[PDB]
Amino acid sequence: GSHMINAQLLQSMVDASNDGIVVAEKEGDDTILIYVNAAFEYLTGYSRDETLYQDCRFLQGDDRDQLGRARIRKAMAEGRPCREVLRNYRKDGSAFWNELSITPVKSDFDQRTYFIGIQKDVSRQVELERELAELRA
Amino acid sequence: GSHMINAQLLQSMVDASNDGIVVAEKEGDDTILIYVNAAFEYLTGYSRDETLYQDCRFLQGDDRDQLGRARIRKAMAEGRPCREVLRNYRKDGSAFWNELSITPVKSDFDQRTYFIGIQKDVSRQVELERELAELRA
Numbered sequence A, B: 001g002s003h004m005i006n007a008q009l010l011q012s013m014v015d016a017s018n019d020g021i022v023v024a025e026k027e028g029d030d031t032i033l034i035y036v037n038a039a040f041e042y043l044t045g046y047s048r049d050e051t052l053y054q055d056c057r058f059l060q061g062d063d064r065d066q067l068g069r070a071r072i073r074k075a076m077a078e079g080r081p082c083r084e085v086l087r088n089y090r091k092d093g094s095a096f097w098n099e100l101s102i103t104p105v106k107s108d109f110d111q112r113t114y115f116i117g118i119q120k121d122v123s124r125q126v127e128l129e130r131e132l133a134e135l136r137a
């Protein structure tokens, strides 16, 4: 993989990062979570066991009609990365805007595909874009 | 570290991510790079060997008078994470705004400290904030 650094050290650096970091394995139309760090649990409010081993579309809830889904689905199919923002809902019920940075990865040894995502609450930048759009009009 | 996923797989997921990812080890007033991924090389334009094993303050160049430095230095000293934006300069000479998400990590076995950072070009959001500040005035 990379001769520069020990893999265990890199894994601990990821576990402790303040950014949410998840890894997902493709299974047909779905993509199933296999790794979440502590930062992700804090961003979502769901426990590690509560959230693992399912497509994390459940964070969308009933707000299923969002333009971000399609561009994510189209990029995943094309095997290209993407960066889209959706409106997610925490376990306690809070609503926020989540910027998803998804990168498709293909392990040729297994001939299946994985995905790594880095999430960040950008609800501030969203509310600043809405304010700017209002002033422009 | 984490029983969920193989560390080598996680390392390859990091090597291939579209986000820039670096790991740095503290050495006194400096903090020295030990890991960079391919996305970081593309964001900066410097090769992997050109950039490793030095404090990546060199990306600031002569533009050394930036408020981001101090808040990063104050957070690193306090052992708390931070998210600051600086004006960096590529190897070709391009100027952009880089959002740094730095998380201090302490390996008690070695009794030294590491840092993991995730970088992203947010020059678009910066230019949208300047435009909004102008319209507000």
Ligand SMILES: Cc1cc2nc3c(=O)[nH]c(=O)nc-3n(C[C@H](O)[C@H](O)[C@H](O)COP(=O)(O)O)c2cc1C
Pocket: A022, A023, A024, A029, A030, A031, A055, A056, A057, A059, A060, A068, A069, A070, A072, A073, A086, A088, A098, A100, A102, A103, A115, A116, A117, A119
């Ligand atoms: C690595 C990765 C991270 C993702 N992050 C979650 C998330 O934080 N919240 C969310 O709303 N969607 C998230 N998604 C997207 C959904 O899992 C889903 O795959 C996407 O919306 C497209 O498929 P769908 O149209 O079948 O829902 C993520 C997907 C991947 C691959």
Ligand SMILES: Cc1cc2nc3c(=O)[nH]c(=O)nc-3n(C[C@H](O)[C@H](O)[C@H](O)COP(=O)(O)O)c2cc1C
Pocket: B022, B023, B024, B029, B030, B031, B055, B056, B057, B059, B060, B068, B069, B070, B072, B073, B086, B088, B098, B100, B102, B103, B115, B116, B117, B119
């Ligand atoms: C993980 C990590 C990533 C960093 N990213 C670089 C970068 O992308 N560009 C930059 O201008 N500063 C970067 N820095 C900050 C500088 O390395 C430096 O440590 C910081 O500006 C504070 O110290 P100084 O005031 O002595 O320069 C990073 C620091 C760490 C720990």
